[PDB]
Ligand binder design. Sequence first.
Ligand SMILES: OC[C@H]1O[C@@H](O[C@@H]2[C@@H](O)[C@H](O)O[C@H](CO)[C@H]2O)[C@H](O)[C@@H](O)[C@@H]1O
Ligand SMILES: OC[C@H]1O[C@@H](O)[C@H](O)[C@@H](O)[C@@H]1O
Lengths: 258, 248
Amino acid sequence: VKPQESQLSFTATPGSNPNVVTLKNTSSLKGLVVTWDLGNGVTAKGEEVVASYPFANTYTIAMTAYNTGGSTTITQTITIANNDESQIEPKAIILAGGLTGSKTWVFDRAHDGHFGVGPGAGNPDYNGTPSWWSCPAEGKAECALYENEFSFHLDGGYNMTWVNKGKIYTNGAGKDKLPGVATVPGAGDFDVEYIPKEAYTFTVDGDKLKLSDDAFFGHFAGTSTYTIKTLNENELYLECSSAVESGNGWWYRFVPKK
Amino acid sequence: SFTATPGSNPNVVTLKNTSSLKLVVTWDLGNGVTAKGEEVVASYPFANTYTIAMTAYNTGGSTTITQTITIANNDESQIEPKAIILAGGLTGSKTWVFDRAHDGHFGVGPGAGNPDYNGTPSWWSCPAEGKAECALYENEFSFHLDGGYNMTWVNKGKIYTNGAGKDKLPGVATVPGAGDFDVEYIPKEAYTFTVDGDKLKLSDDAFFGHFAGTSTYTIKTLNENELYLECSSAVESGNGWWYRFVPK
Ligand SMILES: OC[C@H]1O[C@@H](O[C@@H]2[C@@H](O)[C@H](O)O[C@H](CO)[C@H]2O)[C@H](O)[C@@H](O)[C@@H]1O
Ligand SMILES: OC[C@H]1O[C@@H](O)[C@H](O)[C@@H](O)[C@@H]1O
């Protein structure tokens, strides 16, 4: 009674934009209600629906046909070859150095002001700058900070890789919130043992950059949320608000790895 | 013949020779750019009507055909982000005035070239309403992206300055309640600006109501709520000025 699979079919035809695909019931059987799992977290109902895949990947599309004696499901895989710049955050494209490949960012250790502290954005004294202390060139050479490197890549999603040599840098208020062994390096404050996960994601919304899985840009201040102050192919300048020291703001400047 | 075909970005247009005659062609895109090629791309960041001219060349000489094109909207992707904040968006306008109700909306200190520079108006910081009794707060600045980076300067006929400034200006100077000088100074009907990084430059010798002999300002803060500016005096060597504007 339930619809027979050999009479069910559909076409999935990329349109003007190869990442936007028309899904059309072409079944040799009428009197059907059809629903769709687009394989991208979206479900839909209708004879002809459109599916959008911002990211290059292989997806599975399921069509379910309903008639008076039940439902039957058929599938196709579809290969989306390339990322769609028109459906991806423009700042994510700068962080990854393009829609293809990856881009690694490191502390701007060769120039003054690559790391700094000042009154944070909720502090009555905020001025938007690290007005308490600004790190001179190579000022944090003698700790774990510059060992922390951040690669962005749009391989299936808004993906990040965090590499270090097993340690992050923080101060007394930071060290108390992490389980790893704390050491006092040459630059003072604390190195803490902290091994990143093998994979992260991120989101960009306006100026706000958020890292997944409680990640942070090598300096621990209890937050995974940053404000992008500057971002172009040469420079990533970030501000954050400390969650471990009420009213402290931190600034960080990254440049491309050579 | 030619076609002017808006692409995936409606502000970016493919100009293509479609002539039924196989020619060297050049183009005036009507945006200040000229080009040579069978197929060229034109960019119009600003909504407007533009005239495109194709010139075809043989041995006999040259013939020029034109079309008008209408670009409906401003293109956020090709306009300075700080310009959009000053104009309050891609449409309409936004007027900025002195933050007269808060301390520190006007001040003086050692300027950025001065060995004593500390980045603040450390010689004098104006208290709330401190310059009510002069022309300073009468000066209002509107930014609008209507064809370009456009500004309108409104006042009630006077700017505010000190002795060194008054000596550079042709208008009559008067001493108001706040002291220093009001100077007769009527703005032009229209100005332009440029923003490059943190450098804000005004056209046609304009200045932000207080005269210090410069049209160049450093942007210290710019968000939808605040414009905080520094400038370096061109009439008093080593003197810096600070100004804080908020929306009207
Ligand atoms: O905390 C308020 C005070 O901050 C002081 O600067 C400190 C920096 O020298 C140091 O490098 O970082 C700590 C925070 O991690 C800062 O507190 C300022 O010098 C004081 O002016 C300020 O009141
Ligand atoms: O115009 C410059 C002068 O401004 C005055 O308000 C300050 O008190 C002086 O310190 C400064 O020399």
